[PDB]
Amino acid sequence: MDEGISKKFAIQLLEDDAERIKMLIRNQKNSLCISQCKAFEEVVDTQMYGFSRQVTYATRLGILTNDEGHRLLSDLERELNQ
Amino acid sequence: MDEGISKKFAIQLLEDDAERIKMLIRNQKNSLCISQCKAFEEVVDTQMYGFSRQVTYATRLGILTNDEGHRLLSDLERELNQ
């Protein structure tokens, strides 16, 4: 019985579905997703480091006292660990 | 001399800069960034598993021969390894 029609249909549907799943897999492996999260993390580290360098420099110069300098770094440190 | 003006300015700039750095840290510690990447990864796995379940079901029914069924799964497997 023509229902060879249904089998033929089911088979090409499955093949076309495979393509859709392969596209998903490609969009995954080609994602910049994690990489983008890590790049942002890197910006923050560098921003934090450059500012902290300045707190230290201000302390060397006597613009901050040692405790003042240490309190600022301690606040950054405290932020970092929640 | 004031210049005590400059020192006063430098100290408050350093404090305000500290707030900008803490804002960055908070904004990254509150990042749902990695989570969102992993969530999508999870959608893809589930999409692929559901389809794969159907390839298997079709093979059981005789709609695909065993080699056909195995080929499709083998193609998805290949994509997963690029």
Side-chain angles (χ1 to χ4, degrees):
Chain A
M1 206 167 182
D2 271 74
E3 273 295 50
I5 294 169
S6 285
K7 179 160 149 157
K8 285 192 228 285
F9 174 89
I11 293 173
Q12 66 75 223
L13 180 44
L14 273 170
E15 301 182 313
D16 189 36
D17 282 343
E19 298 307 321
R20 270 190 285 291
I21 301 295
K22 260 135 51 171
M23 161 180 339
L24 294 186
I25 297 173
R26 288 176 193 118
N27 181 279
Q28 249 296 289
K29 301 279 153 202
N30 293 331
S31 203
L32 272 61
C33 200
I34 301 279
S35 143
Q36 286 256 109
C37 302
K38 301 292 297 176
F40 186 52
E41 182 179 49
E42 196 165 289
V43 174
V44 175
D45 290 335
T46 293
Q47 295 267 144
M48 180 176 73
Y49 264 81
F51 162 67
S52 172
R53 183 63 188 94
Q54 292 281 6
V55 171
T56 293
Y57 185 34
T59 304
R60 300 325 187 199
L61 290 177
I63 290 176
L64 299 171
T65 61
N66 259 294
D67 309 334
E68 277 164 356
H70 166 265
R71 169 168 169 93
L72 284 171
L73 299 195
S74 166
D75 298 334
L76 295 192
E77 178 230 311
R78 212 158 68 251
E79 211 53 40
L80 269 187
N81 332 307
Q82 264 40 300
Chain B
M1 186 198 278
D2 32 14
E3 242 8 12
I5 282 165
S6 284
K7 189 169 144 154
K8 278 173 227 293
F9 175 84
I11 296 166
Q12 70 76 217
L13 177 53
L14 275 165
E15 291 166 341
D16 184 37
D17 276 339
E19 301 305 320
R20 270 185 287 288
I21 295 298
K22 289 183 287 190
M23 164 182 336
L24 294 180
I25 297 166
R26 284 176 213 135
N27 169 262
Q28 224 265 138
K29 252 53 212 183
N30 287 314
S31 207
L32 261 8
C33 199
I34 306 278
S35 264
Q36 296 174 63
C37 297
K38 301 297 297 182
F40 180 58
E41 187 182 56
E42 193 166 289
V43 170
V44 172
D45 290 334
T46 292
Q47 291 276 146
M48 168 183 28
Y49 266 82
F51 166 64
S52 175
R53 181 65 188 96
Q54 295 278 7
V55 171
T56 294
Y57 182 29
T59 299
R60 289 345 178 178
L61 286 181
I63 297 179
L64 297 173
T65 57
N66 258 294
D67 302 337
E68 287 164 339
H70 173 265
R71 161 165 189 88
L72 286 175
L73 295 198
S74 149
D75 290 336
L76 297 184
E77 181 234 307
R78 186 193 322 177
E79 204 66 35
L80 277 182
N81 282 263
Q82 289 93 271

